[PDB]
Amino acid sequence: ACTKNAIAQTGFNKDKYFNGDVWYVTDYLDLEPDDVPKRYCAALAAGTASGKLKEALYHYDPKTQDTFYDVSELQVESLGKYTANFKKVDKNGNVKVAVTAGNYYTFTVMYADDSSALIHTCLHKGNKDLGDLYAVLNRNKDAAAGDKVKSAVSAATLEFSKFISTKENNCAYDNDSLKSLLTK
Numbered sequence: 001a002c003t004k005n006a007i008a009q010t011g012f013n014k015d016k017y018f019n020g021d022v023w024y025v026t027d028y029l030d031l032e033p034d035d036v037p038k039r040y041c042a043a044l045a046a047g048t049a050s051g052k053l054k055e056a057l058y059h060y061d062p063k064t065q066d067t068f069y070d071v072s073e074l075q076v077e078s079l080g081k082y083t084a085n086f087k088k089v090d091k092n093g094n095v096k097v098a099v100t101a102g103n104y105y106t107f108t109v110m111y112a113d114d115s116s117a118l119i120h121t122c123l124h125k126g127n128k129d130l131g132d133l134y135a136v137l138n139r140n141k142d143a144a145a146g147d148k149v150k151s152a153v154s155a156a157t158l159e160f161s162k163f164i165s166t167k168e169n170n171c172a173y174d175n176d177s178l179k180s181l182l183t184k
């Protein structure tokens with residue numbers, strides 16, 4: 001179960017975050033960490049598409065090759081805090097698993113600037129028991145976490161040393177599919 005009410009960044013700039021571009025997960029912290037593998041690849045694109053706030057996700061397990069995409073129309077709880085009822089789609093947006101009650105995640109943007117971010121996410125999926133998952137994002141898939149985002153990790157009373165890097169997994173991403181999924 002999730003336990004954190006993450007606080008959104010003061011002065012969060014939604015139009016900059018939700019600009020349609022890709023964010024790569026570079027490091028993550030799962031508070032119930034047999035919930036996610038120690039090796040993993042994820043990325044997202046976030047933007048407004050025909051007036052609707054949307055997020056597209058990509059996950060890839062670099063060892064098993066398990067792959068999936070998702071898209072959601074986000075609902076606003078407060079500035080920087082969203083609820084996302086997801087559908088699993090192929091890379092082209094064709095629905096594999098429709099939106100369903102109880103399949104949603106929340107996310108909170110704790111820190112963002114033009115190039116980096118710290119988010120909290122709480123996933124709910126069927127009768128699974130999942131916990132809080134923080135992620136450091138960058139616009140550049142290879143970027144080491146800088147002082148702005150690391151300071152935000154400390155300000156959340158977390159230790160960056162505990163975050164697991166994605167950098168050594170040979171992750172390669174289909175950026176074109178994340179961007180195009182925003183419309184789907």
Ligand code: FDE
Binds near residue numbers: 040086123
């Ligand atoms: C490492 C990592 C990182 C991440 C991130 C993320 C973000 C930012 C967001 C998210 C979300 C999500 N996820 Fe995530 N993630 C991860 C992981 C994961 C896993 C392992 C999974 C599977 C689960 C189950 O089913 O069991 C997921 C998962 C997930 C999901 C589900 C999808 C479907 O369709 O089913 C979702 C919605 N993820 N995510």
Ligand SMILES: [N]
Binds near residue numbers: 123133
């Ligand atoms: N996740």
